[PDB]
Amino acid sequence: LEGNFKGLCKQIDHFPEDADYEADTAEYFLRAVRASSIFPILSVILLFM
Amino acid sequence: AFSLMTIAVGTDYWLYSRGVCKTKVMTHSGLWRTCCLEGNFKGLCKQIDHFPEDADYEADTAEYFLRAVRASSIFPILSVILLFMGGLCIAASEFYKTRHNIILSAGIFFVSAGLSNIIGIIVYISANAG
Amino acid sequence: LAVLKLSEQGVLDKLKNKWWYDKGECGAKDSGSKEKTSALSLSNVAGVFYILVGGLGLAMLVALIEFCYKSRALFDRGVQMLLTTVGAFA
Amino acid sequence: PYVMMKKNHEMLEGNERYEGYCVDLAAEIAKHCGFKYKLTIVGDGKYGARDADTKIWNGMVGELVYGKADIAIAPLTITLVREEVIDFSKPFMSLGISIMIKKPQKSKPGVFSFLDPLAYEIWMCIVFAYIGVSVVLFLVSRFSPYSESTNEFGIFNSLWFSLGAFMQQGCDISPRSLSGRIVGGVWWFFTLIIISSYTANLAAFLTVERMVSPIESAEDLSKQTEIAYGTLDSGSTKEFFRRSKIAVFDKMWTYMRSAEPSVFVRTTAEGVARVRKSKGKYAYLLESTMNEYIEQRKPCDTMKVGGNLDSKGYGIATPKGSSLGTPVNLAVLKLSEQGVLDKLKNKWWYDKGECGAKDSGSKEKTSALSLSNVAGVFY
Amino acid sequence: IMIKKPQKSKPGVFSFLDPLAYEIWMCIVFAYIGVSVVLFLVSRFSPYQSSESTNEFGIFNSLWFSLGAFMQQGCDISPRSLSGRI
Amino acid sequence: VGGVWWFFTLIIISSYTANLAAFLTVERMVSPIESAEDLSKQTEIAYGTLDSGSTKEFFRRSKIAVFDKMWTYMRSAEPSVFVRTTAEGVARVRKSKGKYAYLLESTMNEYIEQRKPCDTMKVGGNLDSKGYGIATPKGSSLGTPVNLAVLKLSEQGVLDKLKNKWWYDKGECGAKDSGSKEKTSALSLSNVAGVFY
Ligand SMILES: NS(=O)(=O)c1cc2c(cc1Cl)N[C@H]([C@H]1C[C@H]3C=C[C@@H]1C3)NS2(=O)=O
């Protein structure tokens, strides 16, 4: 957005491949739920079923 | 209650604090006659006063009310009078027996004896700021 | 020429603030810059006891005048309707 | 604790009679060098110095100047006038000017410290108002006939209603009459102010006890003068602040000159107890290893704050041009690379202690309310 | 100018109400009177005899409900209608 | 029983309310998690020393019992503590998010901390003692005249002022410029998400 390369999308790696992060077990549990968004996926399941 | 009330008024050991006996030390503090004990002249006393430091009496609009109520005490004293009058109404149960207003009339004094007694404790302590 | 030479070098000012502030035998920042706590004293909250004891005198006196009211003993749609005309115009 | 008298000073002779930090070093320096050594305190009781009026030397350096002593294993500070006439090795310990103050009055609070933000003379009036209100709430709702059976406010109910209002959970039975609700309103506004002021004044304790910061530097010592700070009268420390270039120490030497009482003391040991008689209102400035001696000794109460304000050293001294110069200097460095001196250090600063070192550490473990801070409510 | 060093204070009898200004206390009372009257005007609507006497919010009770909510000690009465509970 | 349990909850919940104000009003720096002795007691925090250094040679030739444990643990970290260059030893602490410490010389420990990215601290005292010395040839006629001037430099306070210029005023942001900065925020959603959880 707000650049002339707008409209170029990217598959987000929520935990990155090369970053300075070492996630705690409170956060690696969290960011996995953030990356694999099971709870919005569970919304898709529970509305449809 | 009224016996210990009259004892508490005319006694002189309300507090033990550090203060002078006389203008030229542990005090034996009373309400009317604030005495001092264990001094050079052990046993002589002093009456209460409301102005150790001399300034305007009316200045803070409650400083006029607070000082005059404490030394000229009426709330521990109206404690005494209302408890005294209600106790005579205890004796007045037999005089006009079964009037069916008299025992109600006595307890109003006793509850008002409690209301007077608690506020006099407050103005005692709040004037003892130092 | 020496006086200018003194004040440019702060010599006067170090002579001054020593002799006024530092040789002063108390502090504006020795005693004012301390932090201490206090528990609340009874003089701090004596007003809430005054309203309370003042309330109980008002709680009894209302009860006693209603006692002689209901022992020694208003619903008319017209004359307070006039009081509705009086007050709302007021 | 460098060299002291042994209690067995009768049965033994000389070398066997005196012990301590330097004596362990003295046998060790003579071990790696291989010379017959002999201990003798100078009877003059003088650190090495020179005077302008006589042009004479004295003490341990002076006997090295005047040929009497052969080596100086002692707490001897390395200065310029001592370098002028005799030698030194590499310095066998490092030390500096430090600040001594007694530990702050860290005690645990009582079991009745949850009652603390309200004064004791208020809690009597809180009960007396509770006795005072609940009887009035009984009387107003029951003295009137107009039938009187419909109410529920007995003497025991009127306590239980009023005790519910003060604890703010509130009870079931509500006043229904006109004047019976006038009393019920005011006690509600009573306990609105008193409980909320309790919650605020409790926040005044826990915050300010986190706000107060102790002394960790000279700058935190410079920026407060309600606690006095001074030095010894005649020593290295007092002259040190005189010739000081740095503006951090420059303000102190002006301040220690511009104090009306005597910030100067006579001896070291009098300066120890003088802090103990000031109780967190005076700090004393002396050498750090001497300061680390005292804060290991009874009554375990003083403490060294901050760091070394400078860096000095104690060194073994040979006569200038004597034959012991290199092999002693070869031996002092040999003990450091072996790390023997650390064992020689940490022995005598701790075995003479009896106090616990590093007992304070940090305050992060007491960040929350502990049990004992509110255990009286369980009681 | 040389004045005396300021004597610090004594907190007043009416200084428990000091953190909130002289403006805001009467605006609480003017909010106290406003909310208590309106719920009486609401609760004396919605009849569906005791249809208009259904719910127990008299004008003195509607003061007592709006007083108990301000002191945080709740009372026995509670609104039943929808516009009463708002 | 209901009366005693009420005054319980009047004190407990208000003590919760008052202290949670104090954490947010006075938000101090966290106390030193690692002192000199205590980092040996943290295996959950790591520590390291140089691959080829005489400071590594100290722990292998130490008989001191706490220092014995330090040499005992440094063989038992996978990957090893032995970084070959100090710039890796600088960078390893920075990217570890605080689990790794690096034991190195106090001069380099200071000067890294007084630079960008302002991203470390130096806690605790020194483990051993050593010194930097002016090296003159044996029998060179400067050598006894030189070290008298070094004593002359230190006795005026110059060698303080030469270093106090060079490590402070030729430094930057540091950790001493962080203490006065007090800012309080609204509680973010992550802070009481556990109540929602
Ligand atoms: N720990 S201590 O203070 O007893 C201490 C103090 C010192 C030690 C060794 C110890 Cl164990 N060695 C050094 C030595 C190493 C080189 C630098 C100075 C001399 C030569 N001197 S020191 O810095 O004065």
Author numbering:
A (entry chain A): 1068 to 1116
B (entry chain C): 1019 to 1042, 1056 to 1161
C (entry chain D): 748 to 820, 1002 to 1018
D (entry chain C): 404 to 549, 565 to 797
E (entry chain D): 502 to 549, 563 to 600
F (entry chain B): 601 to 797
Could you share sentences copied from the article?
Ionotropic glutamate receptors (iGluRs) are tetrameric ligand-gated ion channels that open their pores in response to binding of the agonist glutamate. iGluRs are tetrameric ion channels that mediate the majority of excitatory neurotransmission in the central nervous system. iGluRs share a common architecture that consists of the following layers: an upper extracellular layer of amino-terminal domains (ATDs), which are involved in receptor assembly and regulation; a layer of transmembrane domains (TMDs), which form an ion-conducting channel; a layer of LBDs sandwiched between ATD and TMD layers; and a layer of intracellular domains (ICDs), which have not been structurally resolved. Each LBD comprises two polypeptide stretches (S1 and S2) that assemble into a clamshell-like structure with an agonist-binding site between the upper (D1) and lower (D2) lobes of the clamshell. Here we determine structures of a synaptic complex of AMPA-subtype iGluR and the auxiliary subunit γ2 in non-desensitizing conditions with various occupancy of the LBDs by glutamate.
Indeed, seven distinct GluA2–γ2 structures were determined on the basis of different LBD layer conformations. At 20 µM Glu, the structural ensemble included only six of the possible tetrameric arrangements—NNNN, GNNN, GNGN, GGNN, GGGN and GGGG—with NGNN, NGGN, NGNG and GGNG tetramers not present. Estimates of the minimal pore radius, Rmin, suggested that the gate region is non-conducting in the NNNN and GNNN structures, whereas it can be permeable to water and ions in the GNGN1, GNGN2, GGNN, GGGN and GGGG structures. In the two non-conducting structures, all four M3 segments were entirely α-helical, with a slightly (one helical turn) unwound M3 in subunit A of the GNNN structure. By contrast, non-continuous integral occupancy of the pore devoid of Na+ ions and water in the gate regions of the NNNN and GNNN structures confirmed that these are non-conducting. Pore hydrophobicity increased when the T617 methyl group pointed towards the pore centre, whereas the pore became larger and more hydrophilic by hiding the methyl group into the channel wall and exposing the T617 hydroxyl group into the pore. In the non-conducting state C, represented by the NNNN and GNNN structures, the M3 segments formed straight α-helices, and the methyl groups of all four T617 pointed towards the pore centre ((i) in Fig. 5a). For the channel to open to the first conductance level O1, both AD and CB LBD dimers should have at least one monomer bound to Glu. Although binding of one Glu molecule per LBD dimer creates a substantial separation of D2 lobes in the same dimer (d635 > 25 Å), channel opening requires separation of the D2 lobes in both AD and CB dimers.
